[PDB]
Amino acid sequence: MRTEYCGQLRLSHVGQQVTLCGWVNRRRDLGSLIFIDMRDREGIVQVFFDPDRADALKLASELRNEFCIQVTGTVRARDEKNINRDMATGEIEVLASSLTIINRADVLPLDSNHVNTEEARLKYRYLDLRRPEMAQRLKTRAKITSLVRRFMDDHGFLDIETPMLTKATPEGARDYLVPSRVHKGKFYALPQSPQLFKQLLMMSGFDRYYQIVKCFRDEDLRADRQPEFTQIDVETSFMTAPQVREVMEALVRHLWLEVKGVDLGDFPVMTFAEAERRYGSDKPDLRNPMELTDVADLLKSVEFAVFAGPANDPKGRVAALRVPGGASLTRKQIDEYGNFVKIYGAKGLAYIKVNERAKGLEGINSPVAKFLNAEIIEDILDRTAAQDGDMIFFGADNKKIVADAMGALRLKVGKDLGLTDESKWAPLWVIDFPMFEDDGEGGLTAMHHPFTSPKDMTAAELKAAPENAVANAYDMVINGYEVGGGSVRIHNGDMQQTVFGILGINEEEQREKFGFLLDALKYGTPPHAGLAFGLDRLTMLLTGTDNIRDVIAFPKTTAAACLMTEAPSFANPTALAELSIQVVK
RNA sequence: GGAGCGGUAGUUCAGUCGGUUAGAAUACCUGCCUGUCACGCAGGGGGUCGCGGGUUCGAGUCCCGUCCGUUCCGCCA
Numbered sequence A: 001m002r003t004e005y006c007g008q009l010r011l012s013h014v015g016q017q018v019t020l021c022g023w024v025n026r027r028r029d030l031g032s033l034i035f036i037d038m039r040d041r042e043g044i045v046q047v048f049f050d051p052d053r054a055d056a057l058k059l060a061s062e063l064r065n066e067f068c069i070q071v072t073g074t075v076r077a078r079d080e081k082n083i084n085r086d087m088a089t090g091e092i093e094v095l096a097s098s099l100t101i102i103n104r105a106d107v108l109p110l111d112s113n114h115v116n117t118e119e120a121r122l123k124y125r126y127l128d129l130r131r132p133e134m135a136q137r138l139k140t141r142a143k144i145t146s147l148v149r150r151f152m153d154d155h156g157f158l159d160i161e162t163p164m165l166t167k168a169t170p171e172g173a174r175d176y177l178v179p180s181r182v183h184k185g186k187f188y189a190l191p192q193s194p195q196l197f198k199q200l201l202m203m204s205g206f207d208r209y210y211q212i213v214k215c216f217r218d219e220d221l222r223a224d225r226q227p228e229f230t231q232i233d234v235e236t237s238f239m240t241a242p243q244v245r246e247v248m249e250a251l252v253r254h255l256w257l258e259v260k261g262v263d264l265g266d267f268p269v270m271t272f273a274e275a276e277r278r279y280g281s282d283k284p285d286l287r288n289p290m291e292l293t294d295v296a297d298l299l300k301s302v303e304f305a306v307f308a309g310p311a312n313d314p315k316g317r318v319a320a321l322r323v324p325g326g327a328s329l330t331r332k333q334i335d336e337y338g339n340f341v342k343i344y345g346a347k348g349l350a351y352i353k354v355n356e357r358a359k360g361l362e363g364i365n366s367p368v369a370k371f372l373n374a375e376i377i378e379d380i381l382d383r384t385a386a387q388d389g390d391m392i393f394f395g396a397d398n399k400k401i402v403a404d405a406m407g408a409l410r411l412k413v414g415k416d417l418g419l420t421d422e423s424k425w426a427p428l429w430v431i432d433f434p435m436f437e438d439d440g441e442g443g444l445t446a447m448h449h450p451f452t453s454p455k456d457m458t459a460a461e462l463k464a465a466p467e468n469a470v471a472n473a474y475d476m477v478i479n480g481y482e483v484g485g486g487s488v489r490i491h492n493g494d495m496q497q498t499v500f501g502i503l504g505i506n507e508e509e510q511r512e513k514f515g516f517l518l519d520a521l522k523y524g525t526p527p528h529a530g531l532a533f534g535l536d537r538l539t540m541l542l543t544g545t546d547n548i549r550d551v552i553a554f555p556k557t558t559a560a561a562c563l564m565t566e567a568p569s570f571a572n573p574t575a576l577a578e579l580s581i582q583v584v585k
Numbered sequence B: 001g002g003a004g005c006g007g008u009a010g011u012u013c014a015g016u017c018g019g020u021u022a023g024a025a026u027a028c029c030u031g032c033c034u035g036u037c038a039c040g041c042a043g044g045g046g047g048u049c050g051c052g053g054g055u056u057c058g059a060g061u062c063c064c065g066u067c068c069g070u071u072c073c074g075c076c077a
């Protein structure tokens, strides 16, 4: 029904008859003259209506925003006067010889003249997706997947699909379940990732695998989290972590080059320990120049238990955050920050306004000065390299609270005071993550996942000293976003079994839930390692949104709902009956 | 499970430490306009303040419950 896409018409088309299909982006009725900006995915084109073609003109008067129309006309260069230089089709327009209204559009539930509410935009996602800004992110995402596939294929990775109807197994995130019609009382679990299958594909002899696959984790959301999302899943055999990182880094450098014309350069590498030490984060945003400064060894003897406790406790920490120019923060702003760190568990937010270091105690306003002394403060100021007019904030607690509260404060302040170079691209690898994480109940949980190999330990060693063991795992982070992560896998049954034991998974549960894995490990399993990227997050970064919803055609709300279709919904009892389940009273 | 913010014509935004016909923009309808491109110009109708309950002489404004969006904490192979 079309011979050309509106948005592609140029002077080079002048004199041609074309038929266009699209929508009325805008309608300008000047009485005996009507301008119709016709839109389709390639852009907007001006369609002109003269009293010369009274019929076409008269009909064109019925045109309202978003009406779907077909127009046949002649392309003619517009008078040097009128030529619009802000339109790709500016130096031309189409003289309408024929107009057809494919479909009217009722009153729009979204007014293109306003920034509409996220709720209305999701409810009428199909209308929202008509906007170029939105549409463009999806087009770009398709270019990214296209670039990924060509690259991965060119690097010998095999695109192998894995099942969505899988087995429910402990650890990780919460699984979405699918009740089985065939097996009363049994359920499938949607996959959190294809982790176990890609490892098995490795044990199958495929040597490099990848897949752009949907993942499902029944967890609440955030601006960068959706319960169903897409990974660029990757697995290799007979390769080390650095080798995996090398090709994975190359992919990302390729994507940035081809998509943004930006060369990211070699990725800096940082250990988990250093990232936590310096930024109180395992996904540090290196665009923010501020760092944390440990000052516990300076506060061991202060009387102030708020500092003395964390300072003396090896599980404690006192990290100072030097805020350039922060001395000018108002009492309001400081109270706000105080409340902000409370979100992360901090019990308070001691600070030191640095007015004049030369003046010692008299050069600094600090509700905590009274607990310190000139020496301590001078030491703190030196180690933080504080300058006149700066502010020093303190995080004093168990290691986690300090990192969470101060790492978070660090980021917030950097944005608030514009200290963070927004333009810059900051990719990095975070490596040497711990194998395990305290579960708060006396146990240990997998930092990444149970199938992650320890960096340089034997099963016996890992079992003897698990809490400190370093995993051979790694995350790729860009501008403070975790965009991907992986690890070298355990290719030895004894080690897998040892890890399950450390995790508190008894033999029964091991056989029950990972028996097929333990068994598979008995048949010449090759060393293997992989990684997975968050396609959505990569796309957010590449299209400049801070919202994951913007890179997903039909995302879910924070209530895991599809406002466009009204999912989820009550079930038909006939269905629940054949699935042998019921909603509890 | 928790905290913050929003919820006002179709859409969107404002709405004074509570004052009684609810403001506008946009949209829509009508009329005029032969070079607009955010066209312009002029007139018209439109919401009863997400929902239920309550305080009060009076509630869009306050309180409670609750629903929706959103940000965050918890949570997150």
Ligand SMILES: Nc1ncnc2c1ncn2[C@@H]1O[C@H](COP(=O)(O)OC(=O)[C@@H](N)CC(=O)O)[C@@H](O)[C@H]1O
Residues within 6 Å of the ligand: A192, A193, A194, A195, A217, A224, A225, A226, A227, A228, A229, A230, A231, A234, A482, A483, A484, A485, A486, A487, A530, A531, A532, A533, A534, A535, A536, A537, A548, B077
């Ligand atoms: N809910 C979510 N919404 C949106 N994006 C998400 C979400 N969860 C994760 N991501 C993104 O996916 C990447 C891979 O996930 P992982 O947990 O590292 O590992 C895995 O699934 C391992 N099997 C990979 C491996 O070991 O090879 C993350 O880095 C992140 O960008």
Ligand SMILES: Nc1ncnc2c1ncn2[C@@H]1O[C@H](COP(=O)(O)O)[C@@H](O)[C@H]1O
Residues within 6 Å of the ligand: A306, A346, A347, A348, A349, A350, A351, A367, A368, A394, A395, A396, A397
């Ligand atoms: N647990 C804590 N961690 C960090 N700072 C704290 C903590 N408790 C109190 N503070 C701060 O230390 C100063 C003295 O606290 P207080 O003696 O409660 O007035 C104030 O700036 C508090 O906000």
